[PDB]
Every structure is written in C-alpha cells, then in structure tokens.
A paper describes a structure:
The venoms of marine cone snails constitute a particularly rich source of peptide toxins, known as conotoxins. The crystal structure of recombinant Mu8.1 displays a saposin-like fold and shows structural similarity with con-ikot-ikot. Functional studies demonstrate that Mu8.1 curtails calcium influx in defined classes of murine somatosensory dorsal root ganglion (DRG) neurons.
To elucidate key structural features of the SLC superfamily, we determined crystal structures of Mu8.1 from 2 different crystal conditions referred to as Mu8.1_38 and 59 at resolutions of 2.33 Å and 2.1 Å, respectively. Each protomer of the Mu8.1 structure comprises 2 regions. The first region comprises an N-terminal 310-helix (310N), followed by 2 α-helices (α1 and α2), and a 310-linker helix (310L). The second region comprises 2 α-helices (α3 and α4), and the C-terminal 310-helix (310C). Moreover, α1, α3, and α4 are held together by a network of contacts between Arg16, Tyr58, Glu68, and Trp72, where ionic interactions are present between the side chains of Arg16 and Glu68, whereas Tyr58 and Trp72 partake in T-shaped pi–pi interactions. The dimer interface is characterized by both hydrophobicity as well as the presence of a water-filled cavity surrounded by the polar residues Thr36, Asn47, Thr52, and Thr56. The residues forming the largely dry (water-excluded) hydrophobic interface include Tyr31, Ala32, Phe49, Ile53, Tyr59, and Val83. Based on evidence from the analytic gel filtration and SAXS measurements, we concluded that Mu8.1 exists primarily as a dimer in solution.
Author numbering:
A (entry chain B), B (entry chain A): 6 to 89
The structure:
Amino acid sequence: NLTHCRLFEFRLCLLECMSLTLDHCYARCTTVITQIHGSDTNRFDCTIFKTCYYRCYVLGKTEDHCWKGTATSVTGDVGDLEFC
Amino acid sequence: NLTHCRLFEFRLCLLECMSLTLDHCYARCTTVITQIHGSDTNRFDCTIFKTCYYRCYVLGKTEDHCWKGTATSVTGDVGDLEFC
C-alpha cells in the first residue's frame, strides 16, 4: 500500500548521506526523493512510516532494527504511531 | 525555533487546497513549500509539528483547534508525539 512512498530509495539516500557524516540528512534526502519521484512521496502515510522509522533511530536503537521493525509492522495508518 | 519550517505558509497552502476540495493536500503543500524554500522545511522537527497537527485533524478534531493547539504546545521535539 506504500509503493508510492519510495521508502527504500529514501533509506538508501539516508544511509549514504549519514555515511558521509552530512548535516540534516532526513531533510536533504526528503528533498531529493521529492525531486526525483514527485509529490506522492510526501503523503501523510509516507510521513507516518518515516516518522516511526526515524524516531526509533533517533531514540538510540539501530538503523537496521528500526527499518525492519517499521517495515514489518507499519502500514502508514495514523494509529500506527502508538506502537511503532 | 521552528521558523525554518515555514509553517504559516504551509497552512496557507493547505487551507486553500482544502477550500478547492483537492486530493492529497498534505502531499501537495509539502511539495510546494520545499520547492519554494528548500530542504530546511523537511527537517524532522518540522515533521514532528506537522504530524501532531494533521493527526489531530485526521482523527476528527476541527482543523483550526488542531493548528492552534499544536502551535502553542509543540516545539518539534521527538517526545512531543507522546501528548500532542
């Protein structure tokens, strides 16, 4: 249901951006994904997935544990924010 | 602290998009704002504010009360999702 979000493309960009220790990778990679793949990648359901994923990471856990956990359990529904 | 998010102009776009009864207004206005102001409007703190506001709206609370409530109470910190 989240094919329009290009969530794997965003993840690749974020990992490469962070590996270069750049600033504001979440913001910059959102901009590139928008410019490459268009406005549908900014839907609220895409935003829910990205927020669950990046919150998990920002709060200490590992990027990989956060990605798999979000990808397996989060469909982009607004209620997902209460367990992800 | 959230001046870089251009949240006022985002709401302007969102309200006009809704008055025209268009689809995917969240996506359309996120895209237009970044196409005007660049990657800074896609920072995670902007995303925290917007998610607090739009979740409140998606769950049936009036749009104006969600925006005003979020603007007085949300600074964009990751913990803000726990009460907004």
